[PDB]
Amino acid sequence: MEQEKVQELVSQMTLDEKIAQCLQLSPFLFKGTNKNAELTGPLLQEMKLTDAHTENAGSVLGSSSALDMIGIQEAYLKTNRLGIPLVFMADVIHGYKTVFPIPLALGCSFDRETVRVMAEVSALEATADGHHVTFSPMLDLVRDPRWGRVMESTGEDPFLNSELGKAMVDGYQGDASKLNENLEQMAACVKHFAAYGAAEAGLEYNTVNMSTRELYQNYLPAYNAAIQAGAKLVMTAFNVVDGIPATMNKWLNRDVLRGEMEFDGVLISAWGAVAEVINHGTARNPKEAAQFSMEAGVDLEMMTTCYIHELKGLIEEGKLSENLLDEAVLRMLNLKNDLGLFEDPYRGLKNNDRTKDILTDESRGKARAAGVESAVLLENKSRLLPLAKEAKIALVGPLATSPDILGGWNVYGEEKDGINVETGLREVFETVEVVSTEYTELSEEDKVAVKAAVQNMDVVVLALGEKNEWGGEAGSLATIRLPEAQYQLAKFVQTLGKPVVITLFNGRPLEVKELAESSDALLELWFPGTEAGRVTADLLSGASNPSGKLSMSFPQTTGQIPVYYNHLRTGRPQTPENKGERYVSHYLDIPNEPFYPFGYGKSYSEFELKTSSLPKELNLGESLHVEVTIKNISDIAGKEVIQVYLQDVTASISRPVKELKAFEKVALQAGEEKTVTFELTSEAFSFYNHQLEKVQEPGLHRVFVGTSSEDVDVFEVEVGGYVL
Amino acid sequence: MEQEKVQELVSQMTLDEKIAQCLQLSPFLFKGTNKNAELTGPLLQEMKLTDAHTENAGSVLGSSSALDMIGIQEAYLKTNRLGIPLVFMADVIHGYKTVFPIPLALGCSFDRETVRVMAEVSALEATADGHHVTFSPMLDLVRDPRWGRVMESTGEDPFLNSELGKAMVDGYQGDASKLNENLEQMAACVKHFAAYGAAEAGLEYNTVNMSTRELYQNYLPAYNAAIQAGAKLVMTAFNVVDGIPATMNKWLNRDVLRGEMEFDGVLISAWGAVAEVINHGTARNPKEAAQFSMEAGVDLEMMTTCYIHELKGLIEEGKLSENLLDEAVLRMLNLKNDLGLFEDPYRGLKNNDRTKDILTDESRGKARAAGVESAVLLENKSRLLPLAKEAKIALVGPLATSPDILGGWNVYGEEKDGINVETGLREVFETVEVVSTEYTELSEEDKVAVKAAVQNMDVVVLALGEKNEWGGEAGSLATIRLPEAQYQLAKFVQTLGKPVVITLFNGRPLEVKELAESSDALLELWFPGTEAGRVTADLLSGASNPSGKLSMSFPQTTGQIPVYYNHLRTGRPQTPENKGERYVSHYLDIPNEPFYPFGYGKSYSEFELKTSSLPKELNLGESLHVEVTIKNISDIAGKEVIQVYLQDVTASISRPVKELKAFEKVALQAGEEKTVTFELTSEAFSFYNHQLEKVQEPGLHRVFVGTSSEDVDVFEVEVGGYVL
Numbered sequence A, B: 001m002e003q004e005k006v007q008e009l010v011s012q013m014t015l016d017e018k019i020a021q022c023l024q025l026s027p028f029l030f031k032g033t034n035k036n037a038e039l040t041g042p043l044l045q046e047m048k049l050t051d052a053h054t055e056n057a058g059s060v061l062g063s064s065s066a067l068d069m070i071g072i073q074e075a076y077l078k079t080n081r082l083g084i085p086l087v088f089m090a091d092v093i094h095g096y097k098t099v100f101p102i103p104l105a106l107g108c109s110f111d112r113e114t115v116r117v118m119a120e121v122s123a124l125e126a127t128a129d130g131h132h133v134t135f136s137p138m139l140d141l142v143r144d145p146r147w148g149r150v151m152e153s154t155g156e157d158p159f160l161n162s163e164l165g166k167a168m169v170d171g172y173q174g175d176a177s178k179l180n181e182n183l184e185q186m187a188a189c190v191k192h193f194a195a196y197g198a199a200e201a202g203l204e205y206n207t208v209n210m211s212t213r214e215l216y217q218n219y220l221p222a223y224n225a226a227i228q229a230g231a232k233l234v235m236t237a238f239n240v241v242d243g244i245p246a247t248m249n250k251w252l253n254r255d256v257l258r259g260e261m262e263f264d265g266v267l268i269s270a271w272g273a274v275a276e277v278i279n280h281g282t283a284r285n286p287k288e289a290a291q292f293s294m295e296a297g298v299d300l301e302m303m304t305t306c307y308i309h310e311l312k313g314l315i316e317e318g319k320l321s322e323n324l325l326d327e328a329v330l331r332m333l334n335l336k337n338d339l340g341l342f343e344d345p346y347r348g349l350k351n352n353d354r355t356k357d358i359l360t361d362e363s364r365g366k367a368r369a370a371g372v373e374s375a376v377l378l379e380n381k382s383r384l385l386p387l388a389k390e391a392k393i394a395l396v397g398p399l400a401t402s403p404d405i406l407g408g409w410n411v412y413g414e415e416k417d418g419i420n421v422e423t424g425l426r427e428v429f430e431t432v433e434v435v436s437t438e439y440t441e442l443s444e445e446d447k448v449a450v451k452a453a454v455q456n457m458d459v460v461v462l463a464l465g466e467k468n469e470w471g472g473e474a475g476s477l478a479t480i481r482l483p484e485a486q487y488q489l490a491k492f493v494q495t496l497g498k499p500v501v502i503t504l505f506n507g508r509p510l511e512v513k514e515l516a517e518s519s520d521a522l523l524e525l526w527f528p529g530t531e532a533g534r535v536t537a538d539l540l541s542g543a544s545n546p547s548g549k550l551s552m553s554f555p556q557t558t559g560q561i562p563v564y565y566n567h568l569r570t571g572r573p574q575t576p577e578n579k580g581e582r583y584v585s586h587y588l589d590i591p592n593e594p595f596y597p598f599g600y601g602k603s604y605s606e607f608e609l610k611t612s613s614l615p616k617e618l619n620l621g622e623s624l625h626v627e628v629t630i631k632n633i634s635d636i637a638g639k640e641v642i643q644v645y646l647q648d649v650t651a652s653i654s655r656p657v658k659e660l661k662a663f664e665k666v667a668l669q670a671g672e673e674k675t676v677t678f679e680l681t682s683e684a685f686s687f688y689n690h691q692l693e694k695v696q697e698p699g700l701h702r703v704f705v706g707t708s709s710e711d712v713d714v715f716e717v718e719v720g721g722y723v724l
């Protein structure tokens, strides 16, 4: 409907109606739910909610099905005075019912189209089950794998994170201006504004502190890129940002988000984060938390009651302008309008059961493709991999038969529909002998059974891994290791004198040095999702050729954290010309290098890259154009990730030794050759100075072209002269 | 001499003389050195230094003896045109020849007078060997025991560090206006400005980042306190501060240090730090490093040549004002004048050999007293300790006989003057059997020998520890554990049936859970210094009663780092009520609490504290006066450390759960009772706000009185009304 009618609605609502529009509730607090109706009464009472509240609530959080949605919406519109439909929001993080790989695995794909397709299928299915908004992409930069939520990020690089972030937004939303017509797309919500991934000591919800310059330089850019590509909502972070909880941080949300980034959509709290500013000790009570959060421009309170119970009194007493509430209500209403909810409140479902669009075989193939794009081949000594189809496999360990391969933040996907490792392998390999072990134990009886199975077979597939519940939200591990029983199992298996492949399933970087030394090959599958065992079978047999690269550094040990590729030089860098010396930046007990670096991954093919002659000089404001020829010099069809890095050698701020500024994944048949070009615009040469200006300074830059952050050729370009 | 004559001198110097005055060199680059003369000609060449340079250099670093000094000063004054004497500077960190405990141990004393005495004795001896300046106190706040330089800090609390920092300046300098008269006192140099202790991942020289507010709130206060108490010099830090190397950070050094803090003394670079701005990538070359470091107000270049080779040309070319040079030279000259070098360049030594004053028996008793004040008794189950003097001791471990007990940053003390644990013990206990083992091994032969000795005796003194070389500068450990062989050794000894005391020697917090659990008692000696063996024997026999408290948290494990008492609450604090719940700030694998907390330590006595009745309310600006009656309710004389903490319950910045604001160590005979009174000024109630103002806000505070950060009574005060 036309904008004047939306504004008219704000004009016609009562103050109590306006307040309640700023509240989000679980489905079972609404009349007409068709699930968990036993939780409805006790919880209404603890929250002190009444019908006057629920019958005017703005939004639903986490409906269970299309019928829950229809029931709740139909009943709500029977009783709602002005006919304002509810908006339905959910966590579709790496898939709906067809579960794709966890986001950290998707980072390892270095492939933008993989990420868009995952988001498109996610929306196809989520809208088919009645959802209007997804709380995705999660764009928190991560340098600390203790933190369980690393699995929701694309990793340690702001540029990769920005690019894949835009790809998710595009896949979820398509053309943002036609969400009222394209009802298989949905609104995306960028989360968590801001810098939540820097949680101190990897502890959930813990303190974050960094300088404003670093916040601009590294932590904000991906939120910004997704916002600029049209993301419809943003969600606040649980953490403090320079001492003030993000949720009531007026500088952050008013000046930066709404001012500098020009975000004019719904800002929704993280769960309870409005109330939690009290725990943080920056509001005395719910009246203060209400007041400050609305001043900061939080439009929608997720599952707490500060707004419903306190805004009236604040507005009446004059502590808070009613104008701030009207503008919140206007953003809520515009979102609903943008989704077409005033013409069709059932968003395509009322006369059209789209059950047929859920968990299709086409979708399952897309998920499998994504899994084979995302896996990272870490070791492969002796061309152990790929295995011949008639290889006799002893499949052993906790991930041999475990159905827990769908990953964390899988709110709607079902283990029964997933493919485990044994099942996947038996579709490909005629001879498999299996010994399941538990995640945290290694008994004598296990060792006897493993030993018998390995004696019978030719090669061991050792399937190790985390339970998903050891990561995700509030899954912080102080020591980023697997249970010790699993390292003991790898130690045991090695003694049996057969070639060993370790297939590792997990949601964070781990300490894998002992796994690498104990095996001939090591394949990092992360959690691939619904098609996990096929992903595994195809990569091990060579039907698919591994092509993923690490999007997060794998530490030598927990105590090396944080370690990351885009680090500062220091005043005393370790060099090959001084290694051995005492008075340089090093540790007495480990290398400075991570065990495996950013951008690293192996292949069954072999590539050779050649970069075209580059200029020696460049004007300010000018783009560098980088042309690269890649050839597959082996007999095996394969994909490689060409990566381009920049360094600013001398600047007014000590700048990182490398930053990624371009990537493309190139597919090549045996012997095929291709040329690709990259434009590094002058923004690729720019940075935030100590004054917080985005600047370009004349001087020397190095340009690194290669297939990891370590396997690069290097070139020099002197930037100077005039601008443009 | 008079100020006019100092100024006159600046006038009379040539440019080349002014430039060289800003250079500091090792003694063997000067004519007249009586040690390492073979190093002179080659290094003069590598540094491209001439006579015109060395004959006008401003300062000497690390002279080796009184005779090195005299010889160098005689020869230098022979050729120096205007007669400007050299100033001699040295690292007297925790003792000269009489070595005291390491600073982190002196932190655990909680005893201002212990710290002043150490510094007084340090100056007495250092001046006797011809030194004018010491590079102490080191006031870097530390939260990361991976960093080897934690040993040089007094720990994790800015208030303790501030207070103890003032005590050290007072002991070194006494009356700062009378350094030309008091020739047994010496100039103090505060180091390292600023925030060096926040090195990321505990890696030496590494990146430091934090918000400016945090910098003001926690990282700056100790440097400021020492500067306000009259410290004569300041030394720059190796790290970046907000992306700019401290050494050339003009905001840091001109605006904060000289401006806000009103420091008008010599600013000396850390070693090589002027040149190392090149490595950091904030200067292209030595000409830029020179200009930038001089713009920042660095007066004295430690052992690099940027100034010496580049200032002339920068000044002649108009890219640097000569007025900045003249400012630096005048500060150098004024420091010399403050030390009385213009009337007596040998600072009391020339006709007065003070050899007699070095390593006296009186000085040794003061170092032993500092040792018994500084040790911390961590465990003592079933009153194993004190031991009766007729107790039969099996003394075993790497620290049984090791002479390595003087600590890191012991530049002048000698192990041959030190008392080892065996020697110490044998002066007290008639029956000791000794089985030394190596630091990093445990052989079958060791175990047989250990088994025989423990069978013969009644109690085990298990002496465990670090080599001092595993810490100090560029001694970063990624995992804060002793070698595994030591933990094995503790496990083995526990099986032998006999009671075990572990005496631990070290320079950092370590993972000690496994030691606590394998022994009946645990005494943290750190590195007591020269008298270490007598320190250990007196505490174990109870001739001295343990009275130290932890000044730095002992983590549960490496991955808990950083953990510290003055932490923020977060939005989801783990409470006694919600423990076990998934969605709160916690780890899956360890407790939140460190293994031992700030302010914790045991005693052979038992104490009772009670706090006199406090006001419910306070005006803004008003001091809170806290009165505490402590009784010793045991038969054993001892000392308790009374600690007072404040918390700001609600604020415009999320504030820490506690901050230490007062402390006093009280000595009490059996049965004795005392009253101590504390004034918490309105400054104790103040903090830095998001706009970087020092403010006091109205509202609730909690006041905690007790004997650790955990063992406290709590009281509430509402601050409001008008301002005093």
Ligand SMILES: OC[C@H]1O[C@@H](O[C@H]2[C@H](O)[C@@H](O)[C@H](O)O[C@@H]2CO)[C@H](O)[C@@H](O)[C@@H]1O
Pocket (backbone or CB within 6 Å): B062, B407, B408, B409, B410, B411, B468, B471, B472, B473, B474
């Ligand atoms: O230099 C950092 C480091 O200082 C060491 O001091 C040296 C000193 O520099 C040298 O001139 C003298 O001969 O010996 C000492 C070694 O005893 C100190 O020993 C280290 O602990 C500290 O980390």
Ligand SMILES: OC[C@H]1O[C@@H](O)[C@H](O)[C@@H](O)[C@@H]1O
Pocket (backbone or CB within 6 Å): A091, A135, A191, A270, A271, A272, A473
């Ligand atoms: O479940 C809805 C939301 O709850 C928040 O608190 C979580 O941290 C988000 O990641 C999630 O999108």
Ligand SMILES: OC[C@H]1O[C@@H](O)[C@H](O)[C@@H](O)[C@@H]1O
Pocket (backbone or CB within 6 Å): A271, A272, A473, B583
């Ligand atoms: O109350 C804790 C709630 O917090 C949210 O952050 C979680 O994502 C929900 O699982 C949970 O119910």
Ligand SMILES: OC[C@H]1O[C@@H](O)[C@H](O)[C@@H](O)[C@@H]1O
Pocket (backbone or CB within 6 Å): A407, A408, A409, A410, A411, A468, A471, A472, A473, A474
């Ligand atoms: O509650 C927050 C959590 O959402 C759950 O429903 C998911 O299964 C978890 O993996 C995630 O960490």
Ligand SMILES: OC[C@H]1O[C@@H](O)[C@H](O)[C@@H](O)[C@@H]1O
Pocket (backbone or CB within 6 Å): A583, B271, B272, B473
């Ligand atoms: O690296 C050269 C010098 O650096 C200083 O910081 C160290 O303390 C010296 O021990 C060392 O010789």
Ligand SMILES: [Mg+2]
Pocket (backbone or CB within 6 Å): A648, A649, A650, A651, A697, A698, A699, A700
């Ligand atoms: Mg540059």
Ligand SMILES: [Mg+2]
Pocket (backbone or CB within 6 Å): B648, B649, B650, B651, B697, B698, B699, B700
């Ligand atoms: Mg307050």
